[PDB]
Amino acid sequence: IATIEVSDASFSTDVLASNKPVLVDFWATWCGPCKMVAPVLEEIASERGDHLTVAKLDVDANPETAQNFQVVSIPTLILFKDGQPVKRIVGAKGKAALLRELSDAVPN
Numbered sequence: 172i173a174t175i176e177v178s179d180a181s182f183s184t185d186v187l188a189s190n191k192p193v194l195v196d197f198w199a200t201w202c203g204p205c206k207m208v209a210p211v212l213e214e215i216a217s218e219r220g221d222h223l224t225v226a227k228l229d230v231d232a233n234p235e236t237a238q239n240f241q242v243v244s245i246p247t248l249i250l251f252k253d254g255q256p257v258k259r260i261v262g263a264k265g266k267a268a269l270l271r272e273l274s275d276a277v278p279n
Contacts, residue, residue: 172220174212179233186226187254193224194273195249197242199231205246208263212248215266 177185177195186193196212198205216225230237230245240249240256248260250273260272 172217174216174225174227177226177228177233179235182228182233182236186251189224189251191222191224193226193251195251196225196227197230197237197240197247197249198227198245199229202245204263208246208248208269211264211266211269215270 174196175185186195194212194215196205196208198209212225212227215223228236230242237243242249244261246261246263248269249256250258250260258273260269264272
């Protein structure tokens with residue numbers, strides 16, 4: 172299980188209508204930190220594949236979707252559930268940090 176590529180044209184069917192929650196990576200080809208987070212996302216997409224879809228949205232090819240979700244900086248991740256944006260992550264970080272930030276739980 173790897174990431175999927177999505178676009179303005181496919182966002183409704185492939186992100187909003189997804190059965191699984193979808194973590195959408197808003198990125199661009201010229202973007203340095205985007206490159207650092209890409210392998211973390213592929214790892215998560217594999218390890219959590221039965222429970223999570225990870226989608227990539229090139230904001231330069233799809234500026235309509237970026238505008239619609241108020242994504243200005245990149246890399247920005249937005250977690251969608253049942254069509255609804257529920258959480259945003261800003262910036263490149265390691266897998267442990269990212270999963271903990273995504274979580275609504277805290278360790279005791």
